[PDB]
From a paper:
In the present study, we characterized a [name] β-l-arabinofuranosidase, [name] ([name]), which was found to constitute a gene cluster with AGP-degrading enzymes. [name] also exhibited < 1% degradative activity for Araf-β-pNP, Araf-β-OMe, Araf-β-Hyp glycosides, and β-AOSs containing Araf-β1,2-linkage compared with Araf-β1,3-ArafGal2 containing Araf-β1,3-linkage. These results showed that [name] is a β-l-arabinofuranosidase specific for Araf-β1,3-Araf structures. The crystal structure of [name] [name] consists of three domains: catalytic (α/α)6 barrel (aa: 379–820), β-sandwich 1 (aa: 821–920), and β-sandwich 2 (aa: 921–1051). The Zn atom of [name] is coordinated by Cys3-Glu residues, and GH127 and [name] enzymes share this structural characteristic.
Since the region following residue 1052 in the NΔ379CΔ761 structure was disordered, we also crystallized the [name]-NΔ379CΔ933 (aa: 380–1051) construct. The crystal structure of NΔ379CΔ933 was determined at a resolution of 1.70 Å. The NΔ379CΔ933 structure contained two molecules per asymmetric unit, and residues from M379 to E1050 were modeled for both chains (A and B). The Zn-coordination site structure of NΔ379CΔ933 was also almost identical to that of NΔ379CΔ761, but no Tris molecule was identified in the active site. Therefore, we primarily focused on the chain A structure of NΔ379CΔ933. The three molecules, including one in NΔ379CΔ761 and two in NΔ379CΔ933, had almost identical main chain structures, as the root mean square deviation (RMSD) values for the Cα atoms between all chain pairs were less than 0.24 Å. The Zn atom is coordinated by E723, C725, C804, and C805 in [name]. F448 and I522 occupy the active site in [name], whereas W162 occupies this position in BT0349. Therefore, these residues may determine the β-linkage specificity of [name]. In contrast, [name] can act independently on rice AGP. This is consistent with the structural characteristics of [name], which contains no large structural element covering the active site.
Numbering used by the authors:
A (entry chain A), B (entry chain E): 379 to 1050
Write the structure that this text describes.
């Protein structure tokens, strides 16, 4: 197998915690609501509760009856994450065997429930019985976003087909997935005049195109039909025209529709039979509608809707182009609900990363890699508590809030959470995938080329080209990246010249000779590689200030690919949150912390003070690097301000991604 | 502390004898050679002699100069066994305190000698001075197998660290062990071109990996370097590839090497820092080379090189696959040397049990537990004289020999052995450990599970799950095994359905209700337990004939897990042996006795007569159980042949393990 064993200690920890969390779920509990709805033996089990509550107070840990719930959505993500983990390299052999056993139990359990349900309600044969079919597609009786929830199960099944080491389990997942697609078409046929897209359906089009990719030849058209039902072509047409229609749209709702557009492109273009199936017009639309919508959506989001950490949205929605500071600061700091703190739902970056990834695969444009790296570090790796492994919902952008993480709802992390019932936010479900597949986008490989998407210490056993590539990277703690190659084959390594590097300082040495940084048409430097190749790639980290389009005086600092955060005040994870939405924990504001985020130039204006920040972070800069490059790991990166008045002078700045024990400032308030 | 108290009277006797033996050794006499070599005061002491003689005629009780010897090997075993005993439950509180004091004296004494030696020969600092460093590694001046001898001391130091109740002792042992490991590296650095693996080195890799496990972080890599130098990867590679290269290999030399391969596996997989230290290639080879070599070695030894009692080897060697009858019978019955009687060295089964144990711990496969039970009974328990507590070297498989045991070489058993000077064979060293750690493999515990490895009357205080488990077992004298559970926690009990039970008769009753014999993927039946649980497991014993692959007419009989032996003639322990190898006592043939082991069917052919053997040993069988199930202990099991001519008609068959006063037949010669 191709594999990427990850050497980085921080990432190894992050991935290990996820494997441990994943192992803590009991199949019988994950399976309860499917079995109940299918009229099968629940074996006395409770569901995991929270978003995975069902209608029934007996099966719900919290004893609640018909609560607002999203039944099946986290089980789906668990199938995805368990599939990913028992094929990645974070889990030991023993962990993988147990995780793969539990995956198998769940995949077969759902299939068994699907088959029993098909007998009980033949009209809806193929439905995944996570909840009542009667409430499709707008929800009912407390069940929210039915197709969103089902989407996770369908996508999960595809991951199980792709990655289960057990052949039976793969074939069962495929059958389950194809039969669900068939249900979608049947259902729609019997509800011809019902609209399916009004209510959030997640990436259902994406998932069904994936099923079409794995389906037997004779099923492909049926599944493509199901998939195309979930293409929101009105939205795509607007995006493909270069319009920005995002103001007021639910952000995480929208983003996966464009990944689905991209999956339609890939499904048809990778299989001549499917491509030949289309009208020459629809063949054209793959590019003019579907790919263009995704390209434009991505560009519009990054330019006009993205915060310094790669993330987007506030109160779960896109707002006016360019109005980032307003959304993050003019919406209140009261306890509870969704307010200033509700910036940058984390699911959104899972989905943005998948969109960048598939756009990279199709186009090879380096800008998607630049984004991927940035958002991976600054939103995804940043989402996780390194001690508990749990992950964030929102990522507050205004200074003075703590990071708030979910809880397990299992016996995992009992030392932290006791016997608390889990909540299972959407964001925890995309969360478990983030860490199960943490190493899935280090490299991309086609016929001749190995693209280095990110700079991390790892070993890639490139089975396509018969090469082992070992990268040593610690950017931006130290500046030199090395690659050593062994094997029998040959390839071109492709390197990005990061925009976060000091361009003049960038140096490429290949087998002891310097090489020019000549970019291909997609932005990549090419290095021929074979057994014995040795590369030193020097990437001096640039320190930069980054403001908001709508406020020059709201400023974050980034060193290399790492956004910095100031540690403001202590926080207590037991009490530092309230609730909003459906059982979503939200950060409590620390006004005393916020005030410390005043940056007040001693001498000169704000403008002058910003000009005095040196790219090299050296003495004389108004923000100086204080850590010793040759002592401590990457997380010991440290900066301090200079020529500032107030508490700011005393603050240390450190990586945002590793900041969790304290309230923090990522954006600072420049004070003239 | 977890503990297992053994109620079985035979095993209680066996363990108590060992404790008594261990206590008869004086630390000053164990330390003599280490002190002498280090230039320390020997206090006028003589060493114990035999294999524990040194070069010097004045310290050897026998007055020999530079005899064939193995100085340190038995001291090391004694350190192991004293450590095991003073942490087991066979010894009284007084016996534990005394033995612990004596362990302390010996560990500090060796550490003292190690530190003194390091000043006198700074090149070889860390060497354990059992003998001259200059004869490392091939031996010289009468000192044989240097690294094998030092292996025992190293492994000893680990046991002391594991089990000593004195913290100074634990720390002294760890220091000694780690410094020995550093010495291995230094010595090899200074003798880079010397091959270290050609002469038997015992399980040096195993012990050094164990030392890597207990070592301070900053020392682990140095110790792992030492351990891996004793990894005989050429042998492992052949076994991993599924070849049988065993013919002509010394068996006890070979077996512990594979235990070492497993220790490599465990050392790295249980410590994330060590695991993460490995290249991706070597991470894979943990499974593809080391685990697999061990797995295949086990399978090949058991299928093609093992006698009916679980044991292997003739003349200390493996021979041709399947030629067990030939090795055991076509090599002479003359007195002295190593001939037919030299089958089944006893060390070998100590080592096989340890390999099986660690394979079980990693894989949980029930076949390792099946083998463990079989060989623990039929080769290990069978190796001891229940009156003297002394143990066997060889175990003759050809009929007509007596069991020959060692002597104490101490004041222990002086009524039997007088003032005779000890021999301290290998098999006596493993033997003292066998009986010291006699309760160490009744159960295996992991997070949710308690595996019943063997069926013995005991009480297990399971401190991991807060349960006390009282097992009552007498198999195969009576068929019912009962478990009673008390406490406050919960676990799953895991039970084997033994292949030696009559399948159809196996019955499981849990808290009054029969439960099915559903096996997990590893072969185990699962029983939820907690306070007040009561289990009756009915295991009706199967009687069976077991031949040799190379001779259908060379046949042994087994009832449940107990191999039977016929009592043939009286034997006199004072005169019934000669010598072979280095001071090894070997059994003298009784040709009369052998002739009684002729089995001639009255009516029918051999084939017919073997078919007439009933699984239940009932009337009508050609071999019938004659003892009353409800009268006597397990050792009163008795059987007689039916429908046979000659003296065989008159013989009684009883358990092999408790046969010691007579010559015996285990394999019978079927005659048409
Ligand atoms: Zn979310
Ligand atoms: Zn031996």
């Amino acid at each position: 197998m191709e594999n990427v064993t990850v050497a980085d200690e921080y990432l190894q920890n992050a991935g290990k915690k996820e494997v441990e969390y994943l192992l803590s779920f009991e199949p019988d509990r994950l399976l309860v609501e499917f079995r109940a709805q299918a009229g099968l033996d629940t074996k006395g089990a409770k569901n995991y509760g929270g978003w995975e509550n069902g209608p029934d107070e007996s099966r719900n840990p919290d004893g609640s009856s018909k609560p607002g719930r999203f039944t099946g959505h986290f089980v789906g993500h668990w199938i995805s994450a368990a599939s990913q983990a028992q094929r990645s390299t974070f889990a030991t052999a023993d962990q993988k065997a147990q995780l793969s056993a539990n995956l198998t139990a769940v995949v077969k359990g759902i299939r068994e429930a699907q088959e029993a349900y098909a007998k009980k309600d033949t009209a809806n044969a193929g439905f995944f019985p996570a909840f009542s079919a009667s409430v499709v597609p707008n929800g009912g009786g407390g069940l929210i976003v039915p197709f969103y929830n089902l989407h996770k199960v369908e996508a999960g099944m595809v991951q199980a087909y792709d990655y289960s080491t057990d052949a039976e389990t793969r074939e069962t997942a495929k059958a389950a997935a194809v039969d669900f697609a068939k249900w979608v078409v049947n259902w729609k046929s019997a509800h011809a005049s019902t609209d399916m897209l009004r209510t959030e359906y997640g990436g259902m089009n994406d998932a069904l195109y994936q099923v079409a990719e794995i389906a037997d030849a004779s099923d492909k058209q049926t599944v493509l039909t199901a998939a195309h039902l979930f293409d929101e072509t009105a939205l795509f047409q607007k995006l493909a025209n270069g319009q920005d229609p995002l103001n007021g749209l639910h952000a995480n709702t929208t983003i996966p529709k464009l990944t689905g557009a991209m999956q339609r492109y890939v499904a048809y273009t990778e299989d001549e039979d499917l491509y030949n199936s289309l009208s020459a017009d629809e063949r054209g639309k793959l590019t003019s509608l579907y790919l263009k919508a995704a390209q434009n959506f991505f560009d519009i989001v990054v330019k006009d809707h993205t915060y310094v950490n790669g993330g987007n949205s506030q109160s779960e929605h896109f707002h006016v182009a360019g109005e980032l500071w307003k959304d993050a600061t003019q919406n209140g700091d009261q306890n509870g609900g969704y307010r200033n703190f509700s910036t940058v739902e984390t699911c959104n970056e899972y989905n943005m990363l998948k969109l960048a990834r598939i756009l990279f695969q199709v186009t090879k444009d380096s800008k998607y890699s630049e984004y991927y790296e940035h958002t991976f570090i600054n939103a995804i790796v940043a989402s996780q508590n390194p001690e508990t492994g749990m992950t964030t919902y929102f990522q507050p952008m205004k200074a003075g809030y703590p990071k708030v993480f979910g809880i397990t709802g299992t016996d995992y992390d009992a030392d932290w959470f006791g016997g608390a019932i889990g909540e299972y936010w959407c964001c925890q479900g995309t969360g478990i995938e983030n860490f199960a597949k943490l190493n899935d986008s280090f490299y991309f490989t086609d016929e001749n080329n190995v693209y280095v998407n990110m700079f991390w210490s790892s070993t890639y056993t490139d089975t396509r080209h018969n090469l082992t590539i070992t990268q040593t990277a610690n950017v931006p703690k130290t500046e030199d990246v090395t690659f050593e190659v062994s094997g029998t084959g040959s390839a071109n390594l492709k390197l990005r010249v990061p925009d976060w590097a000091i361009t003049n300082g960038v140096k490429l040495v290949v087998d002891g000779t310097e090489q020019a940084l000549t970019k291909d048409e997609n932005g990549w430097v090419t290095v021929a590689i074979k057994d014995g190749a040795k590369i030193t790639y020097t990437l001096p980290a640039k320190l930069q200030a980054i403001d908001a389009a709508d406020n020059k005086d709201w400023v974050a600092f980034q060193y290399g690919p790492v956004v910095l955060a100031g540690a403001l005040t202590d926080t207590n994870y037991k009490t530092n949150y309230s609730y909003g939405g459906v059982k979503v924990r939200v950060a409590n504001y620390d006004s005393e912390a916020n005030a410390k985020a005043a940056v007040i130039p001693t001498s000169g204006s704000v403008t002058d003070w910003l000009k005095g920040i040196k790219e090299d972070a050296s003495e004389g800069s108004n923000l100086v690097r204080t850590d010793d490059p040759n002592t401590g790991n990457r997380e010991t990166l440290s900066f301090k301000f200079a020529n500032v008045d107030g508490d700011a002078a005393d603050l240390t700045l450190q990586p945002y991604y590793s900041t969790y024990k304290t309230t923090y400032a990522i954006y600072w308030d420049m004070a003239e």
